[PDB]
Amino acid sequence: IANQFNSAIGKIQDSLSSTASALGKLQDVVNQNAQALNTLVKQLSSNFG
Amino acid sequence: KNKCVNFNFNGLTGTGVLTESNKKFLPFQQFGRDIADTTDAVRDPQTLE
Ligand SMILES: *[C@@H]1O[C@H](CO)[C@@H](O[C@@H]2O[C@H](CO)[C@@H](O)[C@H](O)[C@H]2NC(C)=O)[C@H](O)[C@H]1NC(C)=O
């Protein structure tokens, strides 16, 4: 049971070391808040008539 | 330079701090713009830096 937990924590390191998209839930929340400020900055360039 | 001022370059009125750029404007351009369409660099009309 200790060997299986120690082996399974070793796979957490290997997974996080390997794959790009896993933390997508947090990066998507950064990307929305950054895209919303970038859209608000681009809207200063508009003439509005 | 390096002080807050009410500038005017060729009628481009504004307020800001002027510093020596390392942006290399091709001869046909007097101004550089930002994402917000505001001027963020300018070529001085008497000494062409
Ligand atoms: C603004 O004035 C300066 C001179 O006061 C003009 O620049 C001169 O240009 C000649 C030819 O390259 C150089 O021999 C001089 O050394 C430059 N002047 C200075 C002060 O060093 C400039 O042409 C004027 N502005 C415009 C738009 O013509």
UniProtKB/Swiss-Prot annotation, chain A:
| Record note on what altering residue 28 to N does | In strain: Delta/B.1.617.2, Mu/B.1.621
Q: What does this protein do?
A: Subunit of the fusion protein that is processed upon entry into the host cell. Mediates fusion of the virion and cellular membranes by functioning as a class I viral fusion protein. Contains a viral fusion peptide that is unmasked after S2 cleavage. This cleavage can occur at the cell membrane by host TMPRSS2 or during endocytosis by host CSTL. In either case, this triggers an extensive and irreversible conformational change that leads to fusion of the viral envelope with the cellular cytoplasmic membrane, releasing viral genomic RNA into the host cell cytoplasm.
Where does the record place the region Heptad repeat 1?
Answer: 1-48
In which organism is this protein found? Severe acute respiratory syndrome coronavirus 2 (2019-nCoV)
For this entry, the protein name equals Spike protein S2'
Reading the lineage from the top rank, the first entry is Viruses
